[PDB]
Design a protein around this motif. Structure first.
Motif, PDB file in Angstrom:
ATOM      1  N   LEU A 130     -43.255 -54.955 -76.063  1.00 44.63           N
ATOM      2  CA  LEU A 130     -42.495 -54.399 -77.154  1.00 44.63           C
ATOM      3  C   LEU A 130     -41.225 -53.205 -76.279  1.00 44.63           C
ATOM      4  CD1 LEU A 130     -44.150 -54.131 -80.246  1.00 44.63           C
ATOM      5  CD2 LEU A 130     -42.650 -55.047 -79.474  1.00 44.63           C
ATOM      6  N   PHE A 131     -42.083 -52.340 -75.527  1.00 51.15           N
ATOM      7  CA  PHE A 131     -41.468 -51.125 -74.591  1.00 51.15           C
ATOM      8  C   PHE A 131     -40.102 -51.213 -73.938  1.00 51.15           C
ATOM      9  CE2 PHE A 131     -41.726 -48.265 -71.388  1.00 51.15           C
ATOM     10  CZ  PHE A 131     -41.759 -46.802 -71.394  1.00 51.15           C
ATOM     11  N   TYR A 132     -40.528 -52.116 -72.871  1.00 49.05           N
ATOM     12  CA  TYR A 132     -39.483 -53.391 -71.967  1.00 49.05           C
ATOM     13  C   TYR A 132     -38.612 -53.995 -73.039  1.00 49.05           C
ATOM     14  CZ  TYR A 132     -43.351 -51.412 -68.656  1.00 49.05           C
ATOM     15  OH  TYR A 132     -43.868 -50.971 -67.786  1.00 49.05           O
ATOM     16  N   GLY A 153     -37.070 -53.063 -76.127  1.00 49.14           N
ATOM     17  CA  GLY A 153     -36.733 -51.970 -75.904  1.00 49.14           C
ATOM     18  C   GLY A 153     -35.417 -51.817 -74.906  1.00 49.14           C
ATOM     19  N   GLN A 154     -35.585 -51.055 -74.269  1.00 46.23           N
ATOM     20  CA  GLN A 154     -34.755 -51.356 -73.052  1.00 46.23           C
ATOM     21  C   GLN A 154     -34.618 -52.361 -72.419  1.00 46.23           C
ATOM     22  OE1 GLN A 154     -38.298 -49.419 -70.713  1.00 46.23           O
ATOM     23  NE2 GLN A 154     -37.147 -49.169 -69.098  1.00 46.23           N
ATOM     24  N   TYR A 155     -34.084 -53.250 -72.482  1.00 51.19           N
ATOM     25  CA  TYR A 155     -33.413 -54.542 -72.608  1.00 51.19           C
ATOM     26  C   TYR A 155     -32.154 -54.066 -73.115  1.00 51.19           C
ATOM     27  CZ  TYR A 155     -31.192 -58.864 -71.898  1.00 51.19           C
ATOM     28  OH  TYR A 155     -30.618 -59.998 -71.754  1.00 51.19           O
ATOM     29  N   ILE A 156     -32.495 -54.167 -74.310  1.00 44.39           N
ATOM     30  CA  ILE A 156     -31.796 -54.145 -75.522  1.00 44.39           C
ATOM     31  C   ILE A 156     -30.740 -52.629 -75.462  1.00 44.39           C
ATOM     32  CG2 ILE A 156     -31.112 -54.206 -78.128  1.00 44.39           C
ATOM     33  CD1 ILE A 156     -33.655 -55.382 -78.524  1.00 44.39           C
ATOM     34  N   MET A 157     -31.509 -51.680 -75.659  1.00 44.66           N
ATOM     35  CA  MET A 157     -30.419 -50.012 -75.101  1.00 44.66           C
ATOM     36  C   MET A 157     -29.512 -50.870 -73.399  1.00 44.66           C
ATOM     37  SD  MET A 157     -33.917 -47.848 -74.858  1.00 44.66           S
ATOM     38  CE  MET A 157     -35.655 -48.600 -75.605  1.00 44.66           C
ATOM     39  N   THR A 158     -29.893 -51.125 -72.794  1.00 46.79           N
ATOM     40  CA  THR A 158     -28.938 -51.310 -71.924  1.00 46.79           C
ATOM     41  C   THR A 158     -27.748 -52.222 -72.202  1.00 46.79           C
ATOM     42  OG1 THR A 158     -31.176 -50.796 -69.756  1.00 46.79           O
ATOM     43  CG2 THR A 158     -29.100 -52.221 -68.968  1.00 46.79           C
ATOM     44  N   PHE A 179     -30.394 -46.754 -82.291  1.00 50.47           N
ATOM     45  CA  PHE A 179     -31.647 -48.628 -82.103  1.00 50.47           C
ATOM     46  C   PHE A 179     -32.072 -47.617 -81.563  1.00 50.47           C
ATOM     47  CE2 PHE A 179     -32.918 -50.677 -78.514  1.00 50.47           C
ATOM     48  CZ  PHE A 179     -33.121 -51.684 -79.514  1.00 50.47           C
ATOM     49  N   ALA A 180     -32.281 -46.769 -80.443  1.00 51.91           N
ATOM     50  CA  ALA A 180     -33.322 -45.737 -79.782  1.00 51.91           C
ATOM     51  C   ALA A 180     -34.647 -45.458 -81.303  1.00 51.91           C
ATOM     52  CB  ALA A 180     -33.576 -44.395 -79.229  1.00 51.91           C
ATOM     53  N   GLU A 181     -33.742 -44.636 -82.264  1.00 49.64           N
ATOM     54  CA  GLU A 181     -34.699 -44.359 -83.565  1.00 49.64           C
ATOM     55  C   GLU A 181     -35.520 -45.266 -84.347  1.00 49.64           C
ATOM     56  OE1 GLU A 181     -32.130 -41.600 -85.608  1.00 49.64           O
ATOM     57  OE2 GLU A 181     -33.594 -39.831 -84.927  1.00 49.64           O
ATOM     58  N   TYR A 182     -34.696 -45.963 -84.504  1.00 52.46           N
ATOM     59  CA  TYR A 182     -35.803 -47.660 -85.141  1.00 52.46           C
ATOM     60  C   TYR A 182     -36.543 -48.216 -84.925  1.00 52.46           C
ATOM     61  CZ  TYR A 182     -32.084 -47.160 -88.606  1.00 52.46           C
ATOM     62  OH  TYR A 182     -31.452 -47.258 -90.230  1.00 52.46           O
ATOM     63  N   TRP A 183     -36.130 -48.440 -82.572  1.00 55.22           N
ATOM     64  CA  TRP A 183     -36.413 -49.405 -81.756  1.00 55.22           C
ATOM     65  C   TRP A 183     -38.204 -48.588 -81.631  1.00 55.22           C
ATOM     66  CZ3 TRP A 183     -36.539 -53.996 -81.062  1.00 55.22           C
ATOM     67  CH2 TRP A 183     -37.289 -54.743 -80.481  1.00 55.22           C
ATOM     68  N   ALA A 184     -37.459 -46.795 -81.838  1.00 58.02           N
ATOM     69  CA  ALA A 184     -39.080 -45.910 -81.049  1.00 58.02           C
ATOM     70  C   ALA A 184     -40.739 -45.785 -82.842  1.00 58.02           C
ATOM     71  CB  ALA A 184     -38.893 -44.706 -81.318  1.00 58.02           C
ATOM     72  N   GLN A 185     -40.124 -46.605 -83.591  1.00 56.80           N
ATOM     73  CA  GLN A 185     -40.709 -46.249 -85.159  1.00 56.80           C
ATOM     74  C   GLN A 185     -42.254 -47.678 -84.776  1.00 56.80           C
ATOM     75  OE1 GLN A 185     -38.767 -47.064 -87.940  1.00 56.80           O
ATOM     76  NE2 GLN A 185     -37.552 -45.288 -87.886  1.00 56.80           N
ATOM     77  N   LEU A 186     -41.876 -48.996 -83.637  1.00 58.90           N
ATOM     78  CA  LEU A 186     -42.479 -50.193 -82.954  1.00 58.90           C
ATOM     79  C   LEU A 186     -43.480 -49.363 -82.227  1.00 58.90           C
ATOM     80  CD1 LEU A 186     -39.643 -52.351 -82.344  1.00 58.90           C
ATOM     81  CD2 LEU A 186     -41.330 -52.829 -83.538  1.00 58.90           C
ATOM     82  N   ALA A 187     -43.636 -48.377 -81.802  1.00 58.23           N
ATOM     83  CA  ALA A 187     -44.561 -47.157 -80.905  1.00 58.23           C
ATOM     84  C   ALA A 187     -45.929 -47.305 -81.839  1.00 58.23           C
ATOM     85  CB  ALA A 187     -43.590 -46.412 -80.262  1.00 58.23           C
ATOM     86  N   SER A 188     -45.162 -46.566 -82.773  1.00 56.42           N
ATOM     87  CA  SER A 188     -46.674 -45.984 -83.737  1.00 56.42           C
ATOM     88  C   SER A 188     -47.310 -46.974 -84.169  1.00 56.42           C
ATOM     89  CB  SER A 188     -45.879 -45.074 -84.643  1.00 56.42           C
ATOM     90  OG  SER A 188     -45.925 -45.504 -86.322  1.00 56.42           O
TER      91      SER A 188
END
Ligand SMILES: *CCn1nnc2c1-c1cc(N(C)C)ccc1-c1nnn(CC*)c1-c1cc([N+](C)(C)C)ccc1-2
Lengths: 91, 12
Positions: free
Chosen positions: A37-39, A41-46, B3-12
């Motif tokens: 999920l971490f990586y 997310g990076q793909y989508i951000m870029t 987007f970053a804020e929504y995606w970050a919620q996946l980390a918790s």
């Protein structure tokens, strides 16, 4: 939320998904779901595949992510959906 | 949210 035990389950991504992960800096062959999920997310951000006005909305019809997930779009709010689309790209 | 804020919620 999605259970922590599921988050740190070890998985092996199919070749296309793996290519995507490594393209943003991933180095491994197996990952925990959380790492995937971490990586991702990076793909989508870029590539900025999200909608400008409503940034939980991802449009991927014309992207390799859309080929992988098999959808034209999805919501970042829909965590379980995302996990499922990943589970379908694992060896 | 961003987007970053929504995606970050996946980390918790
Ligand atoms: C809005 C993006 N964001 N918000 N919090 C974190 C991130 C983040 C940023 C970036 N870049 C700008 C390239 C990449 C990845 C993330 C990120 N994705 N998921 N998570 C947590 C689930 C993050 C993230 C992690 C962390 N640490 C590593 C400290 C736990 C801090 C902040 C973000």
């Amino acid at each position: 939320q999605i259970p922590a035990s599921e988050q740190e389950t070890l998985v092996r991504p199919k070749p296309l998904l793996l290519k995507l992960l490594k393209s943003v800096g991933a180095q491994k062959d197996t990952y925990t779901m959380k790492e995937v999920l971490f990586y991702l997310g990076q793909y989508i951000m870029t590539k900025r595949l999200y909608d400008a006005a409503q940034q939980h909305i991802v449009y991927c019809s014309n992207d390799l992510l859309g080929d992988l997930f098999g959808v034209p779009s999805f919501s970042v709010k829909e965590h379980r959906k995302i996990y499922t689309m990943i589970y379908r790209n694992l060896v | 949210l961003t987007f970053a804020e929504y995606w970050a919620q996946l980390a918790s």
